[PDB]
Homo-oligomer: A and B are copies of this chain.
Amino acid sequence: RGEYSVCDSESLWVTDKSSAIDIRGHQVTVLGEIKTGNSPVKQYFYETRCKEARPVKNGCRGIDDKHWNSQCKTSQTYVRALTSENNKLVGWRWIRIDTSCVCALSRK
């Protein structure tokens, strides 16, 4: 996979996540825990983002300079989370979360 890759990134374990955006676009609260009838489990996330928009002054690494215009951007994906709205009723919802670092191309 893109170890060195065209764009550099970082992966980390997020443990504080308390709110987030829905697949519907809503801003919801993310619970700190999960379960019942057994010991409780913590709700955390494995996320990965870009280090910086341009590993090379031009843009992403390994590009055509003249023929292109680039930039590294962090992409999100959907993951299910135990969430709440208003804090009232709790349930599972798809929330957006950083998951990779992609190289976006342009022309001119």
User: Footprint of B on A, CB under 8 Å?
Assistant: 1-7, 11, 34, 36-37, 41, 46, 48, 60-65, 67-68, 70, 73-75, 77-79, 91-92, 94, 99-100, 102-105
Can you list 15 A-B contacts with CB-CB less than 8 angstroms, sorted by A residue number? A1-B75, A1-B102, A2-B73, A4-B104, A5-B103, A5-B105, A6-B105, A36-B37, A41-B92, A46-B77, A46-B78, A46-B79, A60-B62, A77-B99, A77-B100
- Tell whether, in the assembled complex, residue B103 and residue A2 are in contact, meaning their CB atoms are under 8 Å apart: yes
- Chain B positions within 8 Å of A5 at CB level: 102-105
- Tell whether, in the assembled complex, residue A100 and residue B103 are in contact, meaning their CB atoms are under 8 Å apart: no
- The majority secondary structure among interface residues of chain A is strand
Identical copies in the complex:
2
- Chain B positions within 8 Å of A1 at CB level: 73-75, 102, 104
Inter-chain pairs besides A1-B73, A4-B105, A34-B92, 9 sampled, C-beta below 8 Å = A6-B60, A46-B78, A61-B105, A62-B67, A62-B68, A63-B63, A77-B99, A99-B99, A103-B103
Cα-based distance from A36 to B38 in the complex (angstroms): 12
